[PDB]
Design a protein around this ligand. Structure first.
Ligand code: HEM
Ligand SMILES: O=C(O)c1ccc(CCBr)cc1
Ligand SMILES: [Cl-]
Length: 393
């Protein structure tokens, strides 16, 4: 009753152009079985949203990658928030929610925006820059590690560690095996920076440790929660900002609308998250036999959610393959949905907004003027290199 497909959603060919194979996954049926990896898959918005919003049935404590923590040892100690289910998930979630709260955004917004304007001003001085290394990577590196409270030493480990993390969610292919092979130095650095003495006062890290005397988390839970932000906090915004600039580079008409009304920056970034879905996929594990889109899934089965496919499902979106900065983007699943919905989405949106605001005010045109190179990762979608000429406004 369930169609079986041979598509490998973690193959290089798939990463290079996933959209045809994603329509094939959506249109084969509401629930497919991927013979390559022995997992169920849902690529339509409706089922992706349902799975995300049934955390009891589709749990996260058995891992949100392919590996089932009940069957294999996790490559690193489980995240106390991402790889936990309610109620164990609840209190750590609240702490991270207050650490990255609306009130917290007000303390960092001015510095984040000044750093965004400064970067655009710097890039305009060069003209022909790499929107990835010189913008999508350079900007978050100039604000987030400092907002964390990290020392300068060792920050080169941050992106390699994040790439390792997101590759580790995937199947045991060469991307994952190679990432884990090289992980030791990056794990050592990250784990060490998670300790209270190594986090500058007032930053996200020290604020997490400060919540250890409320009874929401104990002192021994703080390092792993700092680890969460060092895992999910940087490389995501890199690919989110990169996708936004990529969209504006490909859709000059939308850049011109953004210039005409820079208050659209925040929605232009949200639309970029939907349109590219930098975070492409996550797994759940069934805790019982479940009926999902006419299929009966047994207990202990991995289910692969195609977030990016769900964000382009024409059953849900009008003109899904068009970048539209005035689109009503509420409901897209690029930040997830439900109890695990991205707790750092205010940071992500802040960085995205202030950067697109800088571009909206300072840039008249963004033209690709060089080979576009894609970066391959089992979970992240984004570019390795995006040469562009920036024309001053
Ligand atoms: C474009 C930027 C970002 C995107 C697209 C993104 C995407 C996502 C998605 C889809 C989830 C859901 C995971 C799941 O359902 O299993 C998630 C969760 C999470 N995100 Fe983000 N994220 C972004 C930025 C950030 C930032 C900046 C931070 C921290 C500063 C962060 C921290 C987290 C954490 C800790 C979780 C786990 C929350 C939980 O399990 O309750 N993310 N993110
Ligand atoms: O808690 C963590 O370490 C963690 C949380 C979320 C992700 C991916 C969603 Br942006 C990865 C790692
Ligand atoms: Cl680690």
């Amino acid at each position: 009753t369930i169609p079986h497909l041979a598509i490998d959603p973690f193959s290089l060919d798939f990463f290079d152009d996933p959209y045809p194979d994603q329509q094939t996954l959506r249109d084969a049926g509401p629930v497919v079985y991927l013979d390559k990896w022995n997992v169920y898959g849902v690529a339509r918005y409706a089922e992706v949203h349902a799975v995300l919003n049934d955390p009891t049935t589709f749990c996260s404590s058995r891992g949100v990658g392919l590996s089932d923590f009940k069957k294999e040892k996790p490559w690193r100690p489980p995240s106390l928030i991402l790889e936990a289910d309610p109620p164990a998930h609840t209190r750590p979630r609240a702490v991270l929610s207050k650490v990255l709260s609306p009130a917290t955004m007000k303390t960092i917004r001015d510095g984040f925006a000044a750093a965004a304007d400064a970067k655009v001003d710097e890039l305009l001085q060069r003209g022909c820059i790499d929107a990835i290394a010189d913008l999508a990577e350079a900007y978050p590196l100039s604000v987030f590690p400092d907002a964390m409270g990290l020392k300068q030493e060792g920050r080169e480990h941050l992106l390699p560690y994040a790439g390792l993390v997101f590759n580790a969610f995937g199947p045991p292919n060469e991307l994952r095996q190679t990432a884990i092979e090289r992980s030791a130095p990056h794990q050592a650095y990250v784990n060490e920076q998670c300790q209270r003495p190594n986090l500058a006062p007032g930053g996200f890290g020290a604020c997490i440790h400060a919540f250890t005397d409320t009874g929401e988390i104990t002192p021994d839970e703080a390092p792993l929660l700092v680890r969460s932000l060092l895992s999910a906090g940087l490389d995501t915004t890199v690919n989110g900002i990169g996708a936004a600039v990529y969209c504006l580079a490909r859709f000059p008409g939308e850049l011109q609308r953004l210039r005409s009304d820079p208050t659209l920056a925040r929605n232009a970034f949200e639309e970029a998250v939907r349109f590219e879905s930098p975070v492409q996929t996550f797994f759940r594990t069934t805790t019982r036999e479940v009926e999902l889109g006419g299929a009966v899934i047994g207990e202990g089965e991995k289910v692969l959610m195609f977030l990016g496919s769900a964000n382009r499902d024409p059953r849900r979106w009008s003109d899904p393959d068009l970048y539209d900065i005035t689109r009503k983007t509420s409901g897209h699943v690029g930040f997830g949905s439900g109890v695990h919905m991205c707790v750092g989405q205010l940071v992500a949106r802040l960085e995205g907004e202030v950067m697109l605001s800088a571009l909206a005010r300072k840039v008249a045109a963004i033209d690709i003027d060089g080979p576009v190179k894609r970066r391959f990762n089992n979970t992240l979608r984004g570019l390795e290199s995006l040469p562009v000429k920036l024309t001053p406004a």
